[PDB]
Design a protein around this ligand. Sequence first.
Ligand code: HEC
Ligand code: HEC
Ligand SMILES: [Ca+2]
Ligand SMILES: [Ca+2]
Ligand SMILES: [Ca+2]
Ligand SMILES: [Ca+2]
Ligand SMILES: [Ca+2]
Ligand SMILES: [Cu+2]
Lengths: 106, 106
Amino acid sequence: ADLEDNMETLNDNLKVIEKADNAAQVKDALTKMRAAALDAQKATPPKLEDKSPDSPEMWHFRAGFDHLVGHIDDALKLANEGKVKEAQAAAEQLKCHCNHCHQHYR
Amino acid sequence: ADLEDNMETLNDNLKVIEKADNAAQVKDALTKMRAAALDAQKATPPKLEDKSPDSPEMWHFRAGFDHLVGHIDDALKLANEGKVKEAQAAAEQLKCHCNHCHQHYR
Ligand code: HEC
Ligand code: HEC
Ligand SMILES: [Ca+2]
Ligand SMILES: [Ca+2]
Ligand SMILES: [Ca+2]
Ligand SMILES: [Ca+2]
Ligand SMILES: [Ca+2]
Ligand SMILES: [Cu+2]
């Protein structure tokens, strides 16, 4: 999967989580998002295409995915406890991080 | 302090950070914001007066301050490293988290 494919997985699964009727459904979507975030973290985005792979910008780009994964893991904790509303609310915290990385790098 | 007073501290100190130029000024304003956020987390906002402490809405209200405080800490670390502009950018990014809670509970 390329970066854009991973981003579609992230986008589609936020919607699945919003519509979910139990916490296990939230968990299944979060699990896919975790893999998509880690795959995306290996990519070089177009806006950084000609910069060095070791550049501060590339490390900052990659760091955004670690924080996103931390949010996914915290939502997974709640989902695995059957706490559907809380897990959905924890997943909504992802959106600002979608926005913030996009502001700088999309 | 009252929830509104804590919100005034958060609001006015964002502007202090935006207009500042040095690490000490940014750090001082972020420190005030952090304390105000921790105190705000203890309140019951007017729109949730009809709710119980373990309601999903109160869980979610408290969780937003946990999140905000974590990102204030990230901004403080940048300020402590002397990265004034990066710390100011992190402070501006807090607004998305402010807005997220407001969309539900303000
Ligand atoms: C950086 C750390 C990012 C995070 C976190 C998220 N996204 Fe992203 N996204 C990022 C880049 C660099 C790009 C541009 C890719 C390109 O090839 O131009 C994108 C793009 C998207 C897209 C559009 C995909 C496309 O066809 O270009 C979507 C729909 C998208 N991103 C969604 C999305 C969501 C929902 C996120 C949070 C859950 C999210 N992204 C995080 C970089 C980063
Ligand atoms: C929930 C987790 C919140 C976060 C994070 C932030 N705010 Fe907030 N804010 C919240 C509520 C429930 C309310 C309404 C309080 C009331 O009694 O009506 C507010 C209100 C404000 C206001 C208006 C103050 C007023 O007199 O009503 C401001 C200017 C404000 N909040 C600012 C603000 C900023 C700048 C934040 C991030 C740094 C922020 N808030 C976070 C709930 C929450
Ligand atoms: Ca493309
Ligand atoms: Ca990875
Ligand atoms: Ca090239
Ligand atoms: Ca916490
Ligand atoms: Ca570091
Ligand atoms: Cu966060």
